[PDB]
Amino acid sequence: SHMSKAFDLVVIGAGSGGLEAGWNAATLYGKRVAVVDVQTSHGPPFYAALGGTCVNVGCVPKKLMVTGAQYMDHLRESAGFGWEFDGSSVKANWKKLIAAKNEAVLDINKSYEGMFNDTEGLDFFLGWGSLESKNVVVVRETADPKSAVKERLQADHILLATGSWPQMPAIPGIEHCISSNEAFYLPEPPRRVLTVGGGFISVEFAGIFNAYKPPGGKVTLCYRNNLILRGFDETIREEVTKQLTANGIEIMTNENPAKVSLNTDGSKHVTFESGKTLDVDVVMMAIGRIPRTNDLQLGNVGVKLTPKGGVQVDEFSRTNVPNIYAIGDITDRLMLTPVAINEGAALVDTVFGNKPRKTDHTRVASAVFSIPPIGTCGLIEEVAAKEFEKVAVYMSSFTPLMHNISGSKYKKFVAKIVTNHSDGTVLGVHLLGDGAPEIIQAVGVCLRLNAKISDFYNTIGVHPTSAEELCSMRTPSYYYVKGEKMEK
Amino acid sequence: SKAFDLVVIGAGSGGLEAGWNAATLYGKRVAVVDVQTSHGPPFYAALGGTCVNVGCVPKKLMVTGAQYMDHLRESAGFGWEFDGSSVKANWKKLIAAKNEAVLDINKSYEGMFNDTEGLDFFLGWGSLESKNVVVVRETADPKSAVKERLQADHILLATGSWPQMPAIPGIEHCISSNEAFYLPEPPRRVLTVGGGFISVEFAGIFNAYKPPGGKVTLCYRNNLILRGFDETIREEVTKQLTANGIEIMTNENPAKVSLNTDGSKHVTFESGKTLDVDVVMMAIGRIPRTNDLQLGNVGVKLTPKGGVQVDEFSRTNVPNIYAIGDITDRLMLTPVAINEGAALVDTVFGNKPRKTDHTRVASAVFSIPPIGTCGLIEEVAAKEFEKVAVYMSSFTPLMHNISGSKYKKFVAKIVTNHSDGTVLGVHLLGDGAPEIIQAVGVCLRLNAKISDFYNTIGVHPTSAEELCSMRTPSYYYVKGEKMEK
Numbered sequence A: 001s002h003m004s005k006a007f008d009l010v011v012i013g014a015g016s017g018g019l020e021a022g023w024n025a026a027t028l029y030g031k032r033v034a035v036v037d038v039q040t041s042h043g044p045p046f047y048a049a050l051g052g053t054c055v056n057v058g059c060v061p062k063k064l065m066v067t068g069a070q071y072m073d074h075l076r077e078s079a080g081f082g083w084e085f086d087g088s089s090v091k092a093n094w095k096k097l098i099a100a101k102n103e104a105v106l107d108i109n110k111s112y113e114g115m116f117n118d119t120e121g122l123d124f125f126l127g128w129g130s131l132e133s134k135n136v137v138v139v140r141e142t143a144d145p146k147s148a149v150k151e152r153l154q155a156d157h158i159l160l161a162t163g164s165w166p167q168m169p170a171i172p173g174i175e176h177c178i179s180s181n182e183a184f185y186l187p188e189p190p191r192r193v194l195t196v197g198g199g200f201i202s203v204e205f206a207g208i209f210n211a212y213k214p215p216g217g218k219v220t221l222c223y224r225n226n227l228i229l230r231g232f233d234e235t236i237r238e239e240v241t242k243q244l245t246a247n248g249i250e251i252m253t254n255e256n257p258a259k260v261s262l263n264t265d266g267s268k269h270v271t272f273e274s275g276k277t278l279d280v281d282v283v284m285m286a287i288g289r290i291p292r293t294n295d296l297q298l299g300n301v302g303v304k305l306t307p308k309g310g311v312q313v314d315e316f317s318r319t320n321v322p323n324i325y326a327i328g329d330i331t332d333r334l335m336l337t338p339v340a341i342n343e344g345a346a347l348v349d350t351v352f353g354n355k356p357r358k359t360d361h362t363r364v365a366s367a368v369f370s371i372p373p374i375g376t377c378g379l380i381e382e383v384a385a386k387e388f389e390k391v392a393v394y395m396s397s398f399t400p401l402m403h404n405i406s407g408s409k410y411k412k413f414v415a416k417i418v419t420n421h422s423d424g425t426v427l428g429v430h431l432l433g434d435g436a437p438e439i440i441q442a443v444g445v446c447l448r449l450n451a452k453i454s455d456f457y458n459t460i461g462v463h464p465t466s467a468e469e470l471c472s473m474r475t476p477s478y479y480y481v482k483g484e485k486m487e488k
Numbered sequence B: 001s002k003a004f005d006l007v008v009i010g011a012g013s014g015g016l017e018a019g020w021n022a023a024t025l026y027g028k029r030v031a032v033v034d035v036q037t038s039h040g041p042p043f044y045a046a047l048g049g050t051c052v053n054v055g056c057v058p059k060k061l062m063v064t065g066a067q068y069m070d071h072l073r074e075s076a077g078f079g080w081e082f083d084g085s086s087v088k089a090n091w092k093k094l095i096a097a098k099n100e101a102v103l104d105i106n107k108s109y110e111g112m113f114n115d116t117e118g119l120d121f122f123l124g125w126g127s128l129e130s131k132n133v134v135v136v137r138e139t140a141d142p143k144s145a146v147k148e149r150l151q152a153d154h155i156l157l158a159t160g161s162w163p164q165m166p167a168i169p170g171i172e173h174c175i176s177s178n179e180a181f182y183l184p185e186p187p188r189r190v191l192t193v194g195g196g197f198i199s200v201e202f203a204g205i206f207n208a209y210k211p212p213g214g215k216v217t218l219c220y221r222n223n224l225i226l227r228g229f230d231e232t233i234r235e236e237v238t239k240q241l242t243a244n245g246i247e248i249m250t251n252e253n254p255a256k257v258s259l260n261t262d263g264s265k266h267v268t269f270e271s272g273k274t275l276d277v278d279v280v281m282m283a284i285g286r287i288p289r290t291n292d293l294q295l296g297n298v299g300v301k302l303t304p305k306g307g308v309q310v311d312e313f314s315r316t317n318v319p320n321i322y323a324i325g326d327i328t329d330r331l332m333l334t335p336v337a338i339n340e341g342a343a344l345v346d347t348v349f350g351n352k353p354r355k356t357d358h359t360r361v362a363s364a365v366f367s368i369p370p371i372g373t374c375g376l377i378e379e380v381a382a383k384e385f386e387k388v389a390v391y392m393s394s395f396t397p398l399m400h401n402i403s404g405s406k407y408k409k410f411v412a413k414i415v416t417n418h419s420d421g422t423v424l425g426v427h428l429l430g431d432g433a434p435e436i437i438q439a440v441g442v443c444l445r446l447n448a449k450i451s452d453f454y455n456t457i458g459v460h461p462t463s464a465e466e467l468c469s470m471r472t473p474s475y476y477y478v479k480g481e482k483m484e485k
């Protein structure tokens, strides 16, 4: 006999949260830390890898792809500013985009491999981790619990940071579908695609495919309810629909796939609940992400799950079992890279540092890299209204000037500030238009600072920008007093 | 004769706000005077002011059109394929395009005049006849035909500013930005003389629209362009403009310009260096526009510098004459004039004294790539506070690894008061900087601490988020001296 490798902390999942935790504990509390993940670089079969979802199959590569997409707009829009070239000569090369995105992701993988190798107290382990018991973490050959054990890891504390995975509805033909995962690796651009879901990934991939589809190509997005983007400011959801339609993407609302069968030429025949049908080369299922709890064998130690099925955790990320924590998408709060980063740091502060700290989950700034994009932070009006007696809304939506010249007149900029009209505290900011995501960041700081609308208007404009619009609104566009919209 | 509550000389940023606010929010009767109704030669500025006619609005659009130079090329990295050899930058098309945008705002501003009760527009040149009387002559010549005398309870000087033309031999062969907005064809060779934003912004505009064998040279008399801006940013913007083909001549200054028979220009510098160019633009400064105002008649006092003298409340030495905007010669910014012009009206036709706050004012340079800035630069803060800390981040973003523009570093710097952690200045370079900085302005109004920044959760992926992920200073200034203690 001989000893198992021993750690202060073992983290399952080398992603947005786990990596911040592992890093913080190794470089700032002098701890020995094990991080398990299922591949060392991006791609099939498991897509996520060293770096996590954000890095291999999320924020980073999609943003490249959305930048890739924006050139369709750019090239068209430049004629207005006098640019001339052979429009007939223009083709959008997917192969070449993917190959770019790929090796860029690979550099991030390779770069984090090197940082493990270079950081004393931080080691990586390739495989599937699970819980044999409350202080033992087994790393196995595959997700199957009968796969050969690779190593047993003795751990004082255990960090569950496995993230989330696409939710695939049980319908006939679901095997004929794909997910965000596979989208990143289509070998050639789909000609007709249907993205299923009215959420941020679907809306996003739609514009991507929209830009890179060949010939008489068509992109259809569908949503089970009236209006895409549940959770976002309601003017934005409408504007963004009209703008997605304008770039030639079509929206199916109050529609939901019920089955998919294969056509004899390999294409996809989709029947919705309503009897309706649609033929596409690809069906991208993007209807929700579910916490990834199944391979962890949490039964072995009895970690309680919420009804929705995420790892239940207190405001400090602790499970019903001492020394086991969870952060990030597996917890089913806000599914965002920076919330997982801020969650892991805080956990490590709490447990290894002198300074206990908990993640603030309100007033989190976020974006949607649609074309144009949304930038948002804080409460939307319909929520604000329920919880505050008097709520004011300030609004503005010129179609901006450059887009009068550029040809895309359909490209509005909406800006919205939602306030507690009783003292003027800004509860929420909601934007759609070019630069929206870049603008919203400091608004985050503003909110954490309890900024009042008076603080917004009293600050002096930067001209000429779209952001200056936010310091020009002084008169409310309308209100809500106890629950009810009014206007005066 | 005609007579009024408020008479405004200059239908510009400051004055048209002043006007409208007095005329609509207070029911007062108002005159506004300008020399032209729409944009362009001969007077360039016109109804709408500098910013609309020959300022922010037109340059923004032209810079937006320059950027497509960068855009068209960077599209390749993302797999866009097209015939590169068929690419032409059509200047006349952009100028025509810019001209209708500007023309339209003019027209609708004249639309606001004919729609609005008790605010009237007057064509011609304004001048102080008497402390209650404004003459509108037909031209700047103070001996020309009177068109109106306007009886003026209160008077407003908002005639803006004008390009400074140094009195060197053959100065007459140079243009300023005014003419630059109207050039019939894009120069093959251009010298922009000046280190400030107007010179820089135009440098890059001509750089994109230059015909095939062309070259944009910029000169500054001192060592580094953009005095007043963050130094890391000045040095970077310099390296990045160089990589995009614009030559920066530092430590050089024109002593004269003489005209060649083919129309071009022979620029001779103090150093004895010479360079031949198609156009010489002069953007070395902008002066108060007070020559034509006939101020002598009442003795409104100007300073040593030449701007009308004013207190915190825009008031001149002469009771009931006031001055806002560029004419006063502080912050030369459209939104500032607009703030000045409206606090004025509130402090004069209402409840509360209101003073425009000149500090911590966010601003931008629309260079390629753009700067956005707010609050103090580090050297100035090391002279007022005892422990200054500098927070720094300078990666070349990934989209630019893929793009081909590996030289496109994003710079993000926070200057702090290290004793309490108050942020005093935030300086940005890179795509988006002018948009990012706006809400930083608000922060700086709410007393933001460096920790108020790191504690806010970032939006990913954005450049902005870098402002929210700096916790350890890169270096310091201790009681004057720079170090990493």
Ligand SMILES: Cc1cc2nc3c(=O)[nH]c(=O)nc-3n(C[C@H](O)[C@H](O)[C@H](O)COP(=O)(O)OP(=O)(O)OC[C@H]3O[C@@H](n4cnc5c(N)ncnc54)[C@H](O)[C@@H]3O)c2cc1C
Pocket (backbone or CB within 6 Å): A012, A013, A014, A015, A016, A017, A018, A036, A037, A038, A039, A046, A048, A049, A050, A051, A052, A053, A054, A055, A057, A058, A059, A060, A062, A127, A128, A129, A130, A161, A162, A163, A164, A180, A201, A292, A295, A296, A327, A328, A329, A330, A335, A336, A337, A338, A340, A341, B459, B460, B461
């Ligand atoms: C398509 C897409 C686009 C997105 N775009 C954005 C965006 O633009 N901005 C933004 O803020 N957020 C975005 N997100 C969200 C962001 O990716 C996630 O919120 C974040 O990556 C998850 O945080 P996490 O800590 O839970 O780590 P994760 O990265 O999700 O998980 C880490 C790792 O756990 C591993 N793992 C799973 N099971 C095991 C096993 N038991 N053993 C070992 N390892 C295991 C996985 O391989 C993975 O590498 C996007 C997400 C997706 C899917």
Ligand SMILES: Cc1cc2nc3c(=O)[nH]c(=O)nc-3n(C[C@H](O)[C@H](O)[C@H](O)COP(=O)(O)OP(=O)(O)OC[C@H]3O[C@@H](n4cnc5c(N)ncnc54)[C@H](O)[C@@H]3O)c2cc1C
Pocket (backbone or CB within 6 Å): A462, A463, A464, B009, B010, B011, B012, B013, B014, B015, B033, B034, B035, B036, B043, B045, B046, B047, B048, B049, B050, B051, B052, B054, B055, B056, B057, B059, B124, B125, B126, B127, B158, B159, B160, B161, B177, B198, B289, B292, B293, B324, B325, B326, B327, B331, B332, B333, B334, B335, B337, B338
């Ligand atoms: C190239 C350039 C780019 C610029 N870019 C920006 C920018 O991006 N952002 C920014 O904030 N600022 C910018 N500015 C500066 C901004 O334009 C000015 O600060 C602003 O317009 C000043 O407003 P004002 O009220 O003082 O008067 P102005 O807007 O300058 O208007 C003064 C008016 O007075 C009129 N006038 C002059 N003499 C008389 C007379 N005797 N009788 C009657 N009328 C008269 C003029 O015709 C003019 O319309 C830029 C300026 C230039 C030159």
Ligand SMILES: COC(=O)CN1C(C)=Nc2ccc(Br)cc2[C@@H]1c1ccccc1
Pocket (backbone or CB within 6 Å): A014, A015, A016, A017, A019, A020, A022, A023, A051, A052, A055, A112, A113, A115, A116, A341
């Ligand atoms: C240069 O600093 C780093 O790149 C190290 N990292 C830090 C500080 N936090 C992370 C958060 C999320 C991810 Br995904 C990656 C990091 C990286 C990192 C690299 C290697 C091992 C752990 C963390």
Ligand SMILES: COC(=O)CN1C(C)=Nc2ccc(Br)cc2[C@@H]1c1ccccc1
Pocket (backbone or CB within 6 Å): B011, B012, B013, B014, B016, B017, B019, B020, B048, B049, B052, B108, B109, B110, B112, B113, B338
């Ligand atoms: C279209 O904007 C308006 O509602 C009227 N304006 C206001 C409120 N402020 C201005 C500040 C600077 C300038 Br330049 C222009 C305006 C316009 C305006 C237009 C015409 C006459 C007076 C004011």
Ligand SMILES: [Cl-]
Pocket (backbone or CB within 6 Å): A092, A093, A094, A095, A096, A188, A189
């Ligand atoms: Cl292709």
Ligand SMILES: [Cl-]
Pocket (backbone or CB within 6 Å): A196, A197, A198, A222, A223, A224, A225, A256, A287
């Ligand atoms: Cl759905």
Ligand SMILES: [Cl-]
Pocket (backbone or CB within 6 Å): B089, B090, B091, B092, B093, B185, B186
């Ligand atoms: Cl041309």
Ligand SMILES: [Cl-]
Pocket (backbone or CB within 6 Å): B193, B194, B195, B219, B220, B221, B222, B253, B284
């Ligand atoms: Cl100079």
Ligand code: NA
Pocket (backbone or CB within 6 Å): A116, A117, A118, A119, A120, A121, A122, A123
């Ligand atoms: Na190591």
Ligand code: NA
Pocket (backbone or CB within 6 Å): A456, A457, A458, A459, A460, A461, A471, A472
């Ligand atoms: Na303002």
Ligand code: NA
Pocket (backbone or CB within 6 Å): B453, B454, B455, B456, B457, B458, B468, B469
């Ligand atoms: Na942060």
